Amino acid sequence: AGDDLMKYKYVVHETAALAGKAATFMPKPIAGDNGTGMHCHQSLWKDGKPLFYDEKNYGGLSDLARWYIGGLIKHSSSVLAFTNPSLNSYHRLVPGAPVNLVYSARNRSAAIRIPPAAKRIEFRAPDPSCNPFLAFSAQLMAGLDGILNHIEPPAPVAGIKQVPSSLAEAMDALEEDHDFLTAGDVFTDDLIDTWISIKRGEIDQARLAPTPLEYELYFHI
């Protein structure tokens, strides 16, 4: 699926370029209009058979599926370090766009929506400015830790867990909560430390850069 998206990105970019145009997967190129999100539909299969479906539940979700959500919510800010790894990512995730870490079937403000072999979990939080291999893996490892620890997610709906307010906050969360990633040596301390280092480098660049907004706000003062 990571190979497909990279192939998907390559075609979109090239087809636009050869047409004399430019295609981008920026989560928020312009202000005042809708951003660009990459909803992720995920599910677990075994012996060619689905696992998330169960007639005895809210959205028709097996305990294996509900725990997957619970792990996704508990490790939310850590997962978003890979699903929303850009400074620009947090101009789309503005509470003005999913920002409430809670799951529901009807509500749209939920980061996790639930639409037998079609029963799946939809993570609306991510955006396509991410590495698909890293983004899809982090979501899987988050769910598995929820299943292995029977993590019960909050009740399907003023005290909802929120997405980080910045790229800096997400990296602090990833730095203090990544044991669920290092399980089975899937993610290594080498990669994690490198990922944080690179992203904190991009934060430092933003720390040095004056913005046109600040000119509008503070120049006359």
Partner 1 sequence: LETKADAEALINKEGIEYVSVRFTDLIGVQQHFTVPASEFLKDAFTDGMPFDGSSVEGFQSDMKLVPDVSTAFIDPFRKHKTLDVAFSIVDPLTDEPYSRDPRQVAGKAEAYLKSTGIADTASFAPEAEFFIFDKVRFENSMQRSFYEVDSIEAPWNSGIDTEDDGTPNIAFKNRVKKGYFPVPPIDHTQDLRDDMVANLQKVGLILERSHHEVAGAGQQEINYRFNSLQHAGDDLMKYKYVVHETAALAGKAATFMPKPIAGDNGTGMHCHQSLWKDGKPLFYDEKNYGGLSDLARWYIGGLIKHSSSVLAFTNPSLNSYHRLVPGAPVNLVYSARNRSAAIRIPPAAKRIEFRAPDPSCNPFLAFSAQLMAGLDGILNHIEPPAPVGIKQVPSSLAEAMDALEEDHDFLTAGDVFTDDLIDTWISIKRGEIDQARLAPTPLEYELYFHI
Q: Which residues bind partner 1 (CB under 8 A)?
A: 24-26, 28-33, 86-88, 90-91, 94, 96, 105-106, 108, 115, 129, 165, 168, 202, 205-221
d(C-alpha 114, C-alpha 12), whole Å: 28
Structure tokens at 19: 């047409």
CB of 197 to partner 1, least distance (A): 15
Q: Cα 100 vs. chain centroid, distance in angstroms?
A: 12
Q: How far is the CB of 213 from partner 1 (least distance, A)?
A: 5
E strand or H helix at 167? helix 167-175
Output the smallest distance, CB 12 to partner 1, in A: 12
Q: Which is nearer to partner 1, 188 or 205 (CB)?
A: 205
CA atoms within 13 A on the CB side of 26: 11
**With respect to partner 1, which residue has the nearer C-beta, 21 or 46?**
21
Q: How many CB atoms lie within 10 A of CB 74?
A: 22
Closest contact distance (angstroms) between CB of 15 and partner 1 is: 13
| Residue closer to partner 1 (CB basis): 122 or 152 | 122
Residue whose CB is less far from partner 1, 7 or 150: 7
Positions at the binding site for L-glutamate: 34-35, 92, 108, 124
Instruction: DSSP for 33-45, please give it.
Output: S------EEE--E
**103 in Cβ contact with 160 (< 8 Å):** no
Specify binding-site residues for ATP. 41-43, 108
